[PDB]
Design a protein around this ligand. Structure first.
Ligand SMILES: Cc1cn([C@H]2C[C@H](O)[C@@H](COP(=O)(O)OP(=O)(O)OP(=O)(O)O)O2)c(=O)[nH]c1=O
Ligand SMILES: *Nc1ccc2c(c1)Cc1ccccc1-2
Ligand SMILES: [Ca+2]
Ligand SMILES: [Ca+2]
Ligand SMILES: [Ca+2]
Length: 341
DNA sequence: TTGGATGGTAGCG
DNA sequence: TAACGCTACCATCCAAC
């Protein structure tokens, strides 16, 4: 098994640098402005120059400006980045039929049948890198290993503009030495739970009672980690199929007034159905985020597809359920469609 | 006894 | 002050039997 993973470098900010080369080598921050007030919202990403000052994905814009006033702050232009991504993903298709688009800027290629060994794999990764740079002026990082997880870890190690093979011997080192927090799928919550069991490395999972690990992190995560630690993870590269399409918005003022919330809702519905394009959903979920940032959702599943017109009145009822079942005011309202025909 | 629907949690792009 | 889009999983719980 040989897996090649491509991960585009500081993607949104890098596109902005291609579009405006005067930006290169200076801090750039790409921002999701929420509408509420001036500079309200969060950072989507930033180039490496900006990151040296602590500006990264997810922090409040106002906060980024306290540590880095000097940078270029740009609004996130999602459609534009998606156009570049779509073009890159079509280039990568030329290297293997077995490809899994993981996100806007990640793809896994199964090249087990295209190359004989890691040496040939490395050469392919360089060809891929060079072709993307020539055709799109975009640098990417390539990770190569025996399965998807270690391929992704290899890319993390070589970021930005890198290429790294993690061979059989280094897989063994990583099982022994990689902080378990650095394994894909392990965030703060799981990592903290792991520390309480004395688990700091993948290898620590081998010598714990399976039922004890399961009771702390659940069956799926327990099985995942043990499989990796046993050097047995071998999940196939497969075509991802979109399962849900949804849209969420921050309202100008927090509200409990149905007639005030409704236009925001209807807007999210129109935006979702537009993206759905020929796909027909059998389920609808409305989500509200209250003043104190709690999340509430109400949904309904039908035995048949939901027309755009039906989605309107169905979403209203779901919002009314939330408003009857939660007395707090609402700050954000969203809708999502799923269970496609 | 069991299995889709339900709403929530965790991770992450 | 704290975006927003998506997958996977988890507990729980009610109607089929
Ligand atoms: C992590 C993250 C990414 N994104 C978007 C912007 C990123 O450019 C894009 C890809 O995410 P990443 O691959 O996580 O980040 P990146 O490409 O900007 O930086 P890196 O060099 O470290 O790989 O997804 C968000 O909108 N919100 C987020 O919280
Ligand atoms: N980004 C994003 C957009 C819409 C929705 C979420 C995330 C979660 C959720 C839950 C229910 C309805 C809509 C959404
Ligand atoms: Ca990236
Ligand atoms: Ca990525
Ligand atoms: Ca982590």
């Amino acid at each position: 098994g040989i897996v090649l993973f491509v991960d585009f470098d500081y993607f949104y900010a890098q596109v902005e640098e291609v579009l405006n080369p005067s930006l290169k080598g200076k801090p750039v921050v790409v921002c999701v402005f929420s509408g509420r007030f001036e500079d309200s919202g969060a950072v989507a990403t930033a180039n490496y120059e900006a990151r040296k000052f602590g500006v990264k994905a997810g922090i409040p814009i106002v906060e980024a400006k306290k540590i880095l006033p000097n940078a270029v702050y740009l609004p996130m232009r999602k459609e534009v980045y998606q156009q570049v991504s779509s073009r890159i993903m079509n280039l990568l298709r030329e290297y293997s039929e077995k490809i899994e688009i993981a996100s806007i800027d990640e793809a896994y290629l199964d090249i087990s049948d295209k190359v004989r060994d890691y040496r040939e794999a490395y050469n392919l990764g360089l060809e891929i890198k060079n072709k993307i740079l020539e055709k799109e002026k975009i640098t990417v990082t390539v990770g190569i290993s025996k399965n998807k997880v270690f391929a992704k870890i290899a890319a993390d190690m070589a970021k930005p503009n890198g290429i790294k093979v993690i061979d059989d011997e280094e897989v063994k080192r990583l099982i022994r030495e990689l902080d378990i927090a650095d394994v894909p799928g392990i965030g703060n919550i799981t990592a903290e739970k792991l520390k309480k069991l004395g688990i700091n490395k993948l290898v620590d999972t081998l010598s714990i009672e399976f039922d004890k690990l399961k009771g702390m992190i659940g069956e799926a995560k327990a099985k995942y980690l043990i499989s990796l630690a046993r050097d047995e993870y071998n999940e196939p590269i497969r075509t991802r199929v979109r399962k849900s399409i949804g849209r969420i918005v921050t309202m100008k003022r927090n509200s409990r007034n149905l007639e005030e919330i409704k236009p925001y809702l209807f807007r999210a519905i129109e935006e979702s159905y537009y993206k759905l394009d020929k796909r027909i959903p059998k389920a609808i979920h409305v989500v509200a985020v209250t003043e104190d940032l709690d999340i509430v959702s109400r949904g309904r599943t039908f035995p048949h597809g939901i027309s755009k017109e039906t989605a309107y009145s169905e979403s209203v009822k779901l919002l009314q359920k939330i408003l009857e079942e939660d007395e707090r005011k609402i700050r954000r309202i969203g809708v999502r469609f799923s269970k496609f025909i």
